[PDB]
Structures are given as C-alpha cells and as structure tokens.
Design a protein around this ligand. Structure first.
Ligand code: AU
Ligand code: AU
Ligand code: AU
Ligand code: AU
Ligand code: AU
Ligand code: AU
Ligand code: AU
Ligand code: AU
Ligand code: AU
Ligand code: AU
Ligand code: AU
Ligand code: AU
Ligand code: AU
Ligand code: AU
Ligand code: AU
Ligand code: AU
Ligand code: AU
Ligand code: AU
Ligand code: AU
Ligand code: AU
Ligand code: AU
Ligand code: AU
Ligand code: AU
Ligand code: AU
Ligand code: AU
Ligand code: AU
Ligand code: AU
Lengths: 332, 332, 332
C-alpha cells in the first residue's frame, strides 16, 4: 500500500535484500519483510553461525532464481528464498563443520531453486503449492550420500539402525518447552525464546496465522502424547514443527477460515504429527531426518483433496494471502 | 433398473447403509449391495471382531465423504467406502488390541477419504482410478510410526530385518488353500471358506469378474512357484491377493475383454506377484507390510500405458461397469 | 535424407533390426543405426553373453511395443528399445546365471515397454521425456524380490547392510580408467576400450554429444573426488555414468546449447554424481543398485524446471534431435 513514487528510490541491492527477507518470511508462509527480519533475529539470537548460513542459503537460492530468470513477481514474493533459508540451516545442524560447508550451503540453496521451479511447473496444473518439498528433496540428495562421500561427517543425530520398540515423565515443562521449540524447530532452532520471537514475527503479518502457529505446535505435542511418544522428543518440539506448518497453511491461507475448514485444518495437524513418527521410522535404517516431509505429504493430500469437497472452500493459490486478507476479499 | 417410485421409500440411514455395502463391494470393484453384504458375511464368518472393524472403517470413510460434501454419485457408488473397509481390517490384523483401536480405525477410515479425493483429483487428469492407494498410504502413515509412538504394539508379523536368502513341499493342499486364501487375503482373511464366499459374492454381480478373481489367485500362486518362493507364503495366498485385484481390474472392467486385453491382463497378474516379493523386501528393514502396493503400482502402470497401445482397448473410467455391461454397451 | 525409393526395398525384418539398432543408440539419446551398431560392438567386445542379452532385451521390448501397437514413429525412433537394452544387460550383470535368465530378460524387456508407454502418457503433459525410468523401475521390480523368490541368486555386488562411514590413492590411472569406464558403465561395461568405442559411436551421430559424454564422465569423477569418495568406485567409473547421461541430455539435446544452458548442464552433471552416493545409500539396507535413478531424478528436476527459467532455452521434446541439428533449426 506504499506510495508509488517510492519505486524511484529502488536499486538492485535493496530489492535483493527485500526479496531475501520476504524469502525468510515465507518459511512460514508470511510474505512480509519485517517477519523475515524478525525470523533472522530469532535465529541469530540462538546461533550466529546458523543465522549467517540461513542468510547465505536464502541469498544463494534467490540469486540463482534471478540468474536463471524466474518471473520477477515469484522472486519478489520470496517464493524462491524460503527453501534456501532451510537448506542453509539444515546442513550445519546435522553435519559437523568443514571449510567446504559454506560452498555446500550455496549449492544446496541453488538446488532448491531448481526444484521449486520443477514443482511449480508440475503441481501448478492443479493449483497446488510446492511447500518445503524443494528444501527437503535437495537436502536429502546432498545429505544421504555422506556415508559414501566423506567430505562432511554426520553429527551424532545421524545414526543408522533398524527400528525397534525409556518413556520419561510429562510435566508442565513438556508443555511450555514443547510449545515454543515446536515453533523454533520449523527452522532447526532448539531455543524457546527463538520460538517466541517466531510467533511475534508471524503476529506482525497476521494474528490468525500466529494463533495457528501456536495451535499446530500444541496439537502436534498432545497427539504425540496421546500416541505414547517418549516425553523427550515431545519436550524438544520434534512433534510440533510439522504440525505448525500444517496449521499455518491450512488455517486460512489455502482455505478460507471457517468452522469447517478449521476442523479440516485440525485433521491435517493431527496426521502431520502421526506422519512424523512414520517418516522418522522409514528413514531410520539410513539414519536420516525426515525434515518437513511429514507436513509436505499430509498437507499436499489435504490440498489436492480440497476441490473435491464442496463443504471445504479452497483459496485459489495465485490469490492466497494472509488469513485476514483472504476473508476480506471473499466478503467483497 | 428399479421402479423410480422406490425413491419415495428412501431415508438417509438406508441410503447410508446401501452406500456402505456398495463400498464393501468396491474392495473388489463390484458396485453391488448384495456383493458387499456377502463380503461382510465372509469376514464375519472368519472373525466377528474383523467384521465389526470392516463395517466401522467403511462407515467412517463414507460419513467423512458425506461430511466434506463429496459429489453424491461418487459416494452412492461406494468409491468412498472400499478403502475404509480395508483400513478398518488392516489395523487389528497387524497390531494387538488396545481400547484406542476403534478410534484409530475411524481415523484411518476418515483419512482414506482425504486421499481418495486427492488421487481422484490427481489421477483424474488421465482417467486413471485411485485403486486401493488411499487405503495403503493412510495405513502406512498410521502404522510405520509404531516404533516411536507406542500406543499400539505390533503383532509378530511385524519384524524389522535386513533381507537375506526353508523351501517346504508343494502338495495339492498348496493349490486348494493357495487359491481360496488368495481371494480371502484381499481383505486380510486367512480363511478358505471366506475365500469361497468372496468368489460367490463377486459371481452375484459378475461371472467374468468371478473367473478373473480365480485366475489371478492361480497366476499369482504359480508365478511365485516358478520364481521359487518357499511354499508356506504360497499356500497362505500371500502371492495371490495382489494378482486377484490385478485380474479383476484388468479383466474386462478397465479394458474391454478380448484375447489381446486378456493377455495384457495376464502380464499384469504375473508382474503383480513378482512386485509382491519386491515390495515385501523394500519394507523389510522396517518390518512393514506392502499391502496392495504391488497391485496398485503394476495396475497403474498398465492403466497409464493403455491409451498408447492401439491394440489394447481401454474402457473410459467414468463409464466402466462390470465386464458383461462393458461388452454390452460396446456392441451398441 | 535418403532416396524415398529405398522404401521399396523395406521388409518387416530389416525395419525391425533398424528399430533395434536405433533402440540401442537411444541408450545415450542417439537416434542413429550405426551408433547402436557400434554400441553393440563395444558390448560384444567386452562380453558375448552381455551382448546377446542386450540384443535380446532390445528385441523383446521393441516387439512388445509393436505387438501392443505403439505409434510407428515412436518405435522407428528406438524409443521402445533403449530401456530394453539396459533391462537385458542389468540382469546377468547383477544376478548369477540360471537357464531361466533369457526368459527373465525377455520379461524385463517387455515390462520396460509398458512403463515407457505409462511415462510418455504421464510426463507428456509437460513435454518431459521418460529417460531410463522404464528400465530402472522394471529392473527394480524384477530384482528386489530375489531374497524371497529364489529362482535367481544375487551376485556378490548385492549385499544388504546398514550404511556406515579405506580411501585408496588417486593416480593418473584413476583418471584414464575413470573417464572411459564412466562411459562404459552407462551400459554396465567394466571395460576401458568399450568406453572408447562408445564415445566413437556417439561421435558418428554427434560431436557435441560425444564431448558431453566425455565432460560428464569427468565432472562425475572429480565431483566424487572433491566429495571424498574412496578412489576404487571413482576409478571404476561408478560416479561417471549418471553424469554421462546428464551431460548428453542437458548438453544441447533438450536444451539449445549456449553458455547459459552449458552452465545449467554442469549443475545437473555435478548433482547427478552427488545423487549417486545418495541413492546408493538409500538402497543399501536391501543391497540393491540405484542404476540410473540418480541421472533420472536430477535430469527430470532440471527438465521440469526449464520452462520457468527465461534464461534457459528448452528444446520442445517432440522436435529434439542432435545438438547440431537443434542449433541448425533454431537459426532458421
Ligand atoms: Au532483507
Ligand atoms: Au537489508
Ligand atoms: Au531489505
Ligand atoms: Au529486511
Ligand atoms: Au503465500
Ligand atoms: Au555460516
Ligand atoms: Au555454516
Ligand atoms: Au495431551
Ligand atoms: Au491436549
Ligand atoms: Au448395507
Ligand atoms: Au443395511
Ligand atoms: Au442397505
Ligand atoms: Au447391504
Ligand atoms: Au467401478
Ligand atoms: Au471392532
Ligand atoms: Au477392532
Ligand atoms: Au506352477
Ligand atoms: Au501353473
Ligand atoms: Au540392427
Ligand atoms: Au540388422
Ligand atoms: Au538393420
Ligand atoms: Au544396425
Ligand atoms: Au531423442
Ligand atoms: Au544371453
Ligand atoms: Au544372459
Ligand atoms: Au578433481
Ligand atoms: Au577436476
């Protein structure tokens, strides 16, 4: 809603950085520069090394899109940044440092941009978004081969084992830590304050999305408890973060918020937590993380199914903004 | 072909139950109330607990479709029941009882309805049916995570191991038991009589489909023997049931029955048995069943390939009825 | 460019054999009879048994296409041969001999033709080629089940293990052997001379494709070295062969060759080598080879992404010939 003359003040660098910050915001579907800026602040609050590498990943993917000539509106909306943000954080989260790390992060970010284009072309025929599939698929391709290609060394989170069947103790701590690390863990941030920062950041762009961030973390948490997860992963928000994404996407962004789409959102948040155990098990023989594949698979299923259900009012993806903006234009 | 005035006697409950029974019939592509009714009778004959849970699964998926507002013809044809029937049986077949079982069955049935809608939207662009993919994908998502989410405990069929290379003895028993449990095992019914009941049930709607049920079970059985499976899985019909589905689908339902489409059907039944060993191995490191993924993958490949082969006359999916009805309308 | 009267000399057998040889040529995207003939000569040079089985596989897939009535131009272009060529070689490469081998090769070749049709129907909606996906998917389905179906016995290359983290010594030999076996290994030919023969064969149809065959082998090799692969797989060309295919496909066939599409090709060749470690690890718990899945997945991603990138000029697939013919018709 800004004065059109402000366009005279633009230059490639500042346009690039605005694209980078919107890119970061889009990790949680928030097309907002200030939201991306506060996401970065939250990460930097936890780890300077992770923040630099988030920025580098978002920059590499955004630049690659511009180099290949993606349509300017797609780039300006940060749709070619968010997968690069995650691609940048995931690598130093899971693998030990080597000098090559920064080069591999740039590569991983560049690759997300290819796959983002692939999936917009593939999925666009049904009006379905790519979500974080570009980040997951690129990262898996760059991570899985580490046992055969030793440049990097995996961290202690990466331990191949056949799955098998202690339980810990649920406390108030499980809930307060689970809630906010569930949000933080969307960006691999094992930090309660970063998690609060993340909610505040979404709140700047959209209050409804901030609430669904909170709801999803909670529904993921207690679904995992009802399903008898040990407490440790729950407290750590490992069953919240896919459900956070599920909540934000289904909660008024890709569907017009009402009672019915709310209940539909809830089914998707519950199944996202259950799919988290499923995919963790699937990849355990090779020791690899499922990342946000749970959110992606379950949310894709609910998105594809939308147009078949008369009682569930989808938002056309090309139009889809904040939940509030969505309801404002429906009522016009 | 019923008197149009019979519509005055309808009420939501009886329409629902007719949808449930057609739903059960569609497990084997039979849109017939009496066929579904006799499928239920066959299951109840084997296990009252499995029959109640088949009914509950079909009911949960059907109701969920109606709640979300699926187009009435899709629901009335039982297309939103059959995956719910399987989702209901599979869970108590593979996992030990807990009070939560019935809730998890309802959830699994509700989820099949989402995925059914997803796949009708996705695959419909090529006129290709969803088959039992909704049941397999939902069930895998609810089953795989059991090692991490302990509410349920897996039965002794579920045992993670890396695959490796005794053989038993083929007898007349291998054949008579293999044949009818091959049919029974389409619905997880380790019972010869249930298997005979199932054939009779299909016979009510379509004789050609009843024959292809029998052929597929046999082709799966002897393919497995030619390929040197140990006898035990063969006798148990574990190499028949994907081939039963392959036979029924390819045998005059999705292709007009003639000599060429017959031979095409046979190739699909053989490869369905071979794909059964393939997918059993693929999932063995996590101890999980492939269910009807073998049938689904191989039958999808033959369905997608149909429109490229001039010598193989596909039935448009929107039209596709019994093999007999298919040939009757081709000749008009 | 041949005299139209030469058509009077045609008969089904000679048309079939021309289709078989073009089929073999298409293993490396070369629609050329002489190229296929010299590919066969290269294989026969290494192993008579592998050459007969390449021929039998190409013949089985081609005949099956003709039996099912594939559009004559598709068959005449060898598009229904190349996956059959690979399907024929892969089985005796990985599994020990049994009398049944030839029957299983014919079956595997017939199956590639189904999947080729499937994928032309599926992918054709985006103008994207099937590549060697028919060969990989058919072969996996026929190979994975070997632990459960003992007709064949796997060779010592097939050894299920959970992955885990010696290095050898890089020499001039690593490079000269790596380069040419990288080309040879596109067809499972552990032979330096066969590899040289293969380059010469491509050179007959297209010099640019021959260069990209060489470049891809090299980029795969040194990517693997930069990524700290042990030397043994590198010397053996196991990190070249997916990158060879990547290079040939991206190097002027599916994209008009220029500086930008060259750099795009390079990104695809690098990621093909990295995806080779990834997929080798993914299948290691079941002991199975990834074959050309690395090339297929990475090249599909770059192909699908092409139409989104204004700076990257795709060749419409229906038109796509040699790099030289591609530039000749662009300039008209
Ligand atoms: Au910025
Ligand atoms: Au800035
Ligand atoms: Au900025
Ligand atoms: Au900013
Ligand atoms: Au958005
Ligand atoms: Au960094
Ligand atoms: Au870093
Ligand atoms: Au709870
Ligand atoms: Au709760
Ligand atoms: Au009923
Ligand atoms: Au009833
Ligand atoms: Au009824
Ligand atoms: Au009934
Ligand atoms: Au039907
Ligand atoms: Au029950
Ligand atoms: Au039950
Ligand atoms: Au037999
Ligand atoms: Au037989
Ligand atoms: Au020939
Ligand atoms: Au010839
Ligand atoms: Au010839
Ligand atoms: Au020839
Ligand atoms: Au071609
Ligand atoms: Au041979
Ligand atoms: Au052979
Ligand atoms: Au190098
Ligand atoms: Au190099």
């Amino acid at each position: 809603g800004r004065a059109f003359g402000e366009q005279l003040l633009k230059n490639p660098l500042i346009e690039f950085c605005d694209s980078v910050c919107r890119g970061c915001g889009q990790v949680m579907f928030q097309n907002n520069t200030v939201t991306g800026l506060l996401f970065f602040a939250g990460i930097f609050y936890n780890s300077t090394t992770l923040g630099v590498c988030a920025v580098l990943g978002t920059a590499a993917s955004t630049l690659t899109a511009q180099l290949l000539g993606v349509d300017k509106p797609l780039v300006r909306a940060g749709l070619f940044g968010f997968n690069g943000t995650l691609a940048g954080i995931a690598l130093p989260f899971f693998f030990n440092y080597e000098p090559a790390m920064l080069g591999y992060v740039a590569l991983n970010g560049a690759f997300t941009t290819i796959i983002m284009a692939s999936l917009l072309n593939f999925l666009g025929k049904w009006g379905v978004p790519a979500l974080t599939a570009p980040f997951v698929l690129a990262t898996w391709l760059l991570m899985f081969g580490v046992y055969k290609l030793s440049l990097f060394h995996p961290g202690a989170l990466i331990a191949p084992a056949l799955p098998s069947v202690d339980m810990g103790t649920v406390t108030g701590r499980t809930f307060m830590e689970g809630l906010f690390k569930g949000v933080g863990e969307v960006m691999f941030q094992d930090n309660i304050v970063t998690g609060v920062i993340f909610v505040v950041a979404i709140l700047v762009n959209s209050r409804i999305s901030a609430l669904f961030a909170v709801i999803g973390s909670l529904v993921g948490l207690c679904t995992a408890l009802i399903m008898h997860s040990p407490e440790t992963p729950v407290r750590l928000g490992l069953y919240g973060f896919n459900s956070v994404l599920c909540g934000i996407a289904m909660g008024g962004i890709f569907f017009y918020l009402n009672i019915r789409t709310f209940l539909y959102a809830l089914g998707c948040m519950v199944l996202g937590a259950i799919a988290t155990g499923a995919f963790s098990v699937l990849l355990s023989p090779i020791g690899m993380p499922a990342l946000t594949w749970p959110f992606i698979v379950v949310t894709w299923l609910f998105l594809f199914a939308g147009s078949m259900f008369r009682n569930i009012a989808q938002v056309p993806t090309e139009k889809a903004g904040t939940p509030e903006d969505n309801l404002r234009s429906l009522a016009i």
